[PDB]
């Protein structure tokens, strides 16, 4: 199918700063990928983002009842949905499962990668660090970055490029908002 | 410090429509348009809240009407296809004989139409597969996840195959044990 496509998107966004103490509401309209008009609660009227949206800004701003509905959305839409969802979204906590395992950079070279695999956590902010015999190892660290699993969990792998020496002990340290204290996992050759 | 987005789209000529809520990049629910039903991303959520699916259908009808307007206002300028990037990973470190899930993450694409097949030793597989709807990105392209529960073995190789109108040929992304 080579027929041309045409796409309309609308995103009604609610931005929360310190819970519901500071709330910004944005109504945004897009044609393909291009935002053409939006209602910002910081402004309290619609504004054309591109020339394509000028007739809608004008038209919609001439409707006083529409503006007043949208001027109220920080309260009747955003604060309301925040209250509905907070317990299982804002307050969702899911502990990181931590696994250390060795691996190889160039296939079939003695193990020279220690992998700290951190799985199934929520929310996303995490800090993973590596230690060799009590010293942080800051060189030789590469990571996948933060990966979203799409099921309200995250994972990340954090790798230490190293040539392990017998009786050296390596520690993977994980700090996350779900924990009261850092989680630590050790490995020895 | 958080963002809730009610994201909607309507696509011609396909007459496809979508309605979903996103919290910090995670889907809370979407509305199955055919079934007129709210579908929770996690089961648990349905016990903590509700949503009336009929509102979504009303919004989509406005989105369809606005698309017709904007299509003419644009002089029928169509969308430019942006092909996806695709990545295949597991949800947990892999152990022979330990059940796991392969994830196929399709991102940065538009329009929101894709064919995705999971392949085992080159043959399509459908048993136990699941998928998300199209998720919005901040750059107004889309993202999507497909899942395949599996038992790892040195005997099997997998690919996630993705077709999209911006690709010259299907993109296959490979996975195997090692």
């Amino acid at each position: 199918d080579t027929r041309p496509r045409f796409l309309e998107q609308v995103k009604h966004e609610c931005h929360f700063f310190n819970g519901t103490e500071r709330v910004r509401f944005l109504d945004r309209y897009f044609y393909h990928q291009e935002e053409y008009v939006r209602f910002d609660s910081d402004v309290g009227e619609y504004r054309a983002v591109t020339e394509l949206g000028r007739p809608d800004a004008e038209y919609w701003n001439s409707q006083k009842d529409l503006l007043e509905q949208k001027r109220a959305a920080v309260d009747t839409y955003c604060r309301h949905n925040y209250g509905v969802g907070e317990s299982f979204t804002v307050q969702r906590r899911v502990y990181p499962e931590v696994t250390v395992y060795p691996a190889k950079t160039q296939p079939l070279q003695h193990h020279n990668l220690l992998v700290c695999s951190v799985n199934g956590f929520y929310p996303g902010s995490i800090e993973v660090r590596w230690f060799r015999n009590g010293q942080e190892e800051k060189t030789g660290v590469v990571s996948t970055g933060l990966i979203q699993n799409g099921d309200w969990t995250f994972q990340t792998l954090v790798m230490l490029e190293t040539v392990p020496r017998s009786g050296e002990v390596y520690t993977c340290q994980v700090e996350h908002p779900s924990l009261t204290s850092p989680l630590t996992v050790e490995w020895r050759a | 410090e958080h963002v809730i987005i009610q994201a909607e789209f309507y696509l011609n000529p396909d007459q496809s429509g979508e309605f979903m809520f996103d919290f910090d990049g995670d889907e809370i629910f979407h509305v199955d348009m055919a079934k007129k039903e709210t579908v929770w991303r996690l089961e648990e959520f349905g016990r903590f809240a509700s949503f009336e699916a009929q509102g979504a259908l009303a919004n989509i009808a406005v989105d369809k009407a606005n698309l017709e307007i904007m299509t003419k206002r644009s002089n029928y300028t169509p969308i430019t296809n942006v092909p996806p990037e695709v990545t295949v990973l597991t949800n947990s470190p892999v152990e022979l004989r330990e059940p796991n899930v392969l994830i196929c993450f399709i991102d940065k694409f538009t329009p929101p139409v894709v064919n995705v097949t999971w392949l085992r030793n080159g043959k399509p597989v459908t048993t136990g597969v699941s998928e998300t709807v199209f998720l919005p990105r901040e750059d107004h392209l889309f993202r999507k996840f497909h899942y395949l529960p599996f038992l790892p073995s040195t005997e099997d190789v997998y690919d996630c195959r993705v077709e999209h109108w911006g690709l010259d040929e299907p993109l296959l992304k490979h996975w195997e044990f090692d």
Partner: peptide, 13 residues
């Protein structure tokens, strides 16, 4: 217990 959908207006016809 109920999430609210925000509605939107119809464009300049």
């Amino acid at each position: 217990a109920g999430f609210k959908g925000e509605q939107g207006p119809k464009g300049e016809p």
